From a paper:
Lysophospholipids are bioactive lipids and can signal through G-protein-coupled receptors ([name]). Here we report single-particle cryo-EM structures of human [name] ([name]) and heterotrimeric Gi complexes formed with bound [name] or the multiple sclerosis (MS) treatment drug Siponimod, as well as human LPA receptor 1 (LPA1) and Gi complexes in the presence of LPA. Our structural and functional data provide insights into how LPA and [name] adopt different conformations to interact with their cognate [name], the selectivity of the homologous lipid [name] for [name] versus LPA, and the different activation mechanisms of these [name] by LPA and [name]. The overall folds of [name] and LPA1 are similar with a short N-terminal helix capping the orthosteric binding site from the extracellular side.
In [name], the ligand-binding site is a cylindrical concavity, 30° tilted relative to the membrane, pointing deep into the helical bundle core until the TM4-TM5 cleft, where the length of the pocket almost spans the entire outer leaflet of the lipid bilayer. The phosphate head group is coordinated by Y29 and K34 from the cap, R120 (in TM3), T109 and the backbone nitrogen of G106 (in ECL1). A previously functionally identified key residue, E121 (in TM3), does not form any direct contacts with [name] in our structure; instead, their interaction is mediated by N101 (in TM2) in the coordination of the amino group of [name]. From the inactive to the active conformation of [name], one essential change is the flipping of the side chain of F210 from the TM3-TM5 interface to the TM5-TM6 interface. In [name], the flip of F210 causes the rotameric change of L214, accompanied by the translational movement of W269 and F265 in TM6 to form new contacts. In its ICL2, L151 is inserted into the hydrophobic pocket at the end of the N-terminal helix of Gαi, and N153 forms hydrogen bonds with D350 and N347 from the α5 helix of Gαi.
Residue numbers in the entry:
A (entry chain B): 3 to 340
B (entry chain G): 8 to 63
C (entry chain A): 7 to 56, 182 to 354
D (entry chain R): 18 to 37, 44 to 239, 248 to 323
The structure:
Amino acid sequence: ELDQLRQEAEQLKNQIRDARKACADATLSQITNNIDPVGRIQMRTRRTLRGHLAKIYAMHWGTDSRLLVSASQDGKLIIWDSYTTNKVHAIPLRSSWVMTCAYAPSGNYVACGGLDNICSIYNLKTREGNVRVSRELAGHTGYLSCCRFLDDNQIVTSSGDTTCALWDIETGQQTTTFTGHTGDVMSLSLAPDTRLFVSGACDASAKLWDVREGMCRQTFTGHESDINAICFFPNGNAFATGSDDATCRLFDLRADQELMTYSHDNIICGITSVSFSKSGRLLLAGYDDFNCNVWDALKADRAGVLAGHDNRVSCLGVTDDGMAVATGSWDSFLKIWN
Amino acid sequence: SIAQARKLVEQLKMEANIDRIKVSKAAADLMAYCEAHAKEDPLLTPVPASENPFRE
Amino acid sequence: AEDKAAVERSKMIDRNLREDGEKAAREVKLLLLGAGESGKSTIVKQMKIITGIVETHFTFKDLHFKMFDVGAQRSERKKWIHCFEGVTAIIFCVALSDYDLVLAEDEEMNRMHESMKLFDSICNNKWFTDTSIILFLNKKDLFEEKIKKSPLTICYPEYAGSNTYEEAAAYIQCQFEDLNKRKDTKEIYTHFTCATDTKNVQFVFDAVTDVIIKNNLKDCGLF
Amino acid sequence: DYVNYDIIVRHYNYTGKLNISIKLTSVVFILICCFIILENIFVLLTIWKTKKFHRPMYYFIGNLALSDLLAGVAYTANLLLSGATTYKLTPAQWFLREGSMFVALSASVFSLLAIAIERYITMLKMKLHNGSNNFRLFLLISACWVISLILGGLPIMGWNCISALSSCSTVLPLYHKHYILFCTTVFTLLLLSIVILYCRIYSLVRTRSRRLTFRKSEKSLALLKTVIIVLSVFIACWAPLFILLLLDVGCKVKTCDILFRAEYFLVLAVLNSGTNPIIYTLTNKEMRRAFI
Ligand SMILES: CCCCCCCCCCCCC/C=C/[C@@H](O)[C@@H](N)COP(=O)(O)O
Ligand SMILES: *[C@@H]1O[C@H](CO)[C@@H](O)[C@H](O)[C@H]1NC(C)=O
């Protein structure tokens, strides 16, 4: 009976709820009550990258902590050199409607995508030639929301068709498909080990996926709207989610339960980006109110503001060495902060 | 319908039987990790101006 | 030694970027929207004589147009609609012959009402407050023939008027234009399309010219 | 010479204005000038406090506002330092006092011309987006202020009635009648320029609109109303003083009595300087919202 097999699901929901509350021994705010606070984090604009003539929708750092790539709606993918500020490359995308950007760990390839439902991979180290398109991955039914390399041959992508996919750049075929989300997947984040990854969707939940097996290990709820951004904690045992309900939440994998909520009454707009600092003690979150707030991950108190943009901060990233923060916005500028 | 309900209940039963940990232990672990790496975070500890590539 | 070459290459890239930008700033941008079985394909086919998102370029009377059709996006629209903030106009297509047809719901959902709901959502959207809408009412001959057999009361039960083509057509136009709450910032240009018109490109051209004049007067402060 | 207290007395005696502290009408005019000053301060405060207003067109509007502010300040000073203070002044101080007024009013008129030129260029091009062509924005404002300074400070560096006493103006006894003729000609050219420019703007809009075919004017009538308001409020408020100066160049000393009551025409011109912000901020429909 369909009626009987629907009733059962509520029983397992109740069982999970109870098995989780049984683990609620003390809130993170208590175990972390006596640690000294961080103090005000004052950061200033070191650089200002100019050259985009439209909104900037994504950015990603390279593993070298010096080169970053940015994607704008003017149909340009620009590879900068943040130190000297000079444009190393400018790639004329075929589809101007890009909303994703990635930089391979090896520094050889860059990926992008968007409303074209395709993930384009451009090769940067081609013998005595200009940057040419290396590959085009086309198996998604919705727009491409996020993509991240695993190595020079594998890439994970999230789409608005409520599905994620692990690809094979050599053959261009979907190696694995991750299903289970009920809404559009808006962001994804790889773990340091590259064995698991979490995804946040518009169904107001996040899911942890196993890359090699393809199953959903755990599901996390609590947000009251779409989850726009998701980032991993440096040690790989927790993550953070920013939503349209003007709130961030910290989840722990081996607890299966929300730990902390970063919110404030004066903040009512949505969150567009979240990232951690190299130590994981700071949580930088970009907002639609044109600002980027620096939360203290272990406590709740806010500890900084990065106000430098005339339009909303759409993308936010931190270098692998933790030396600088990059912030893009709809005003067509990028800023580096120290 | 029926297959979708079966898939949902199977996923929920797979998510139920998981070895969980008390939130106190997880909080202690996060605190320990952040405390061990506090000296390697330029954003946390502004580095000397001579060693910062973006000021030089 | 290698820094000078780097700055040279960066200056060259900036030059190319400026050229490309000032060339792209001379193109009209149109966002094509409509219900399922509207005359989208007909409109794009008759305007081209001059798996994602389809882009159609064309030139008419020394003016270049880029029209973007995004009907193949079954995802939630509120997550990517803002990508089109700044287009020159929105071309919205509505099928008149849908006034007597039901949707896949097949219980109480009238297809014309679904199209009307979509138009109401798009017109009053927070991103499109100053952007004008070119409305194309398609299937006008099929409507003309159908409105002789089944009265228009099947849609808009609060309707009382002649059962002839001109009256009902004007009535539906007014209904679609009464949904415009932002009646002070944007306009709604309407035009009854057929399978064979030969003059829809002209209408889009004139509407865009009017929008350009209005934007210029707003730039000077003269309006 | 330029340090003789007797030159001013001799000229005022010759033109029939010799009279031997703040009178009935001075206070009301002073408060009107203060009102003008604060009005134009508001326009600059709002133009500079809003990121959307950082295009070249609000720079021209702000330039006009600055000119109107300077005109108000100059008129306050000229009204305080006139009257019984005229005989406590040196001819150099007298020349500075009058040149301040000439420079401020000329600057305001040239700012109106600059706004008209920018509007005419924007409509004629009729491009999809208007870029900030900064070269024109700095090459017009500089021309306005430079021409104003050269024209207003010309009598002090010669070209005055000191040597030849017959060529005196009744309204400004130490000025040359030919200088007043020169300034009136410049004003006439600027007025014709502004009228022609706005008429061509209206003609362009109407002609381009009439070629469009729609199913269901109103936008081209509002343009006519705004153009009519602008040109009427300019000509009406500047025509009395222009006619006064022409009459003042026309007749010989002591013949024309009306010339002695010239402080009404001047206050009307400064009233135009004060009315400009109302017209260039009421008909915008976007500065109204930014005000609050
Ligand atoms: C574009 C060119 C525009 C040209 C501008 C024309 C300027 C016209 C200003 C003419 C009047 C200047 C100020 C003179 C005022 C006198 O009436 C009193 N100061 C005399 O007062 P007394 O000392 O006798 O009491
Ligand atoms: C003014 O000039 C007239 C005619 O030259 C002269 O008779 C009269 O005495 C003069 N008055 C003064 C104060 O100089």
